[PDB]
Write a protein that binds this ligand. Structure first.
Ligand code: HEM
Ligand code: HEM
Length: 190
């Protein structure tokens, strides 16, 4: 576990994009407030591993807006940082009724005919995720960010989901409209 108190002093450079409490400004910048600590810590290592200046291809998660930013932080530092954001309360967004209806259907039922499972098993009914298992909280996240992740998983641009490649196999059955409907519904999910 991490020391949130210590962690809040190690986040200066983060605030411009993620906000001081992790409740991001720009839609393309993922909110980190109230996200699970295990998931956060995991993304911090994947990001540090993949976004390091001379990083090898396909290792970790490459985030170019964060190149070499986590390199001087130790793993304990990352723990305090994850404990810091994780303890922040998340803001909720708005789900457009126009899209929410198809998003909810896809979220709760998946696409049985495609053999695509619903999202509720791993991300919980209200999108709060499963911290102990490391399944990310999804509710209230910026739609543009969620849409991008879903697209990335599908195009194989994000690969830090393991050997089971849980999200790449799920996302592979999603259409652009699906993703748009899902990302919008999840943004108002709370
Ligand atoms: C500062 C040291 C810092 C931290 C901490 C941080 C964390 C972080 C995480 C945990 C993610 C993943 C979130 C998730 O998976 O839900 C992530 C992703 C992005 N970040 Fe970040 N981030 C820090 C700093 C910054 C700064 C200063 C910027 C903006 C210039 C930035 C931006 C982004 C972007 C963009 C992503 C998402 C990338 C994508 O998948 O499209 N980060 N951050
Ligand atoms: C259902 C169609 C579905 C959605 C929607 C969904 C989305 C989703 C997103 C957008 C992420 C990234 C979150 C972030 O960057 O903050 C993501 C990541 C993971 N998911 Fe998922 N997910 C859906 C379904 C499922 C199912 C059925 C499972 C469990 C079998 C699951 C699990 C996970 C895991 C694990 C991750 C984390 C990947 C990592 O980098 O560690 N999802 N999901």
């Amino acid at each position: 576990a991490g020391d949130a108190e210590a962690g809040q002093g190690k986040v200066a450079v983060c605030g411009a994009c993620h906000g001081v409490d992790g409740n991001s400004p720009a839609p393309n910048f993922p909110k980190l407030a109230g996200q699970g600590e295990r998931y956060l810590l995991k993304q911090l290592q994947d990001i540090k591993a993949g976004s390091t200046p001379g990083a090898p291809e396909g290792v970790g998660r490459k985030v170019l807006e964060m190149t070499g930013m986590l390199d001087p932080l130790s793993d304990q530092d990352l723990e305090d940082i994850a404990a810091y954001f994780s303890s922040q309360k998340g803001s909720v967004g708005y789900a457009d009724p126009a899209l929410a209806k198809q998003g909810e259907k896809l979220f709760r039922g998946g696409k049985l005919d495609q053999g695509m499972p619903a999202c509720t098993g791993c991300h919980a009914p209200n999108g709060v995720g499963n911290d102990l298992a490391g399944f990310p909280k999804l509710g209230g996240q910026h739609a543009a960010y969620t849409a991008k992740q879903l697209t990335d998983f599908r195009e194989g641009n994000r690969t830090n989901d393991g050997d089971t490649m849980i999200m790449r196999g799920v996302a592979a059955k999603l259409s652009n409209k699906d993703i748009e409907a899902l990302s919008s519904y999840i943004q108002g999910l709370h």
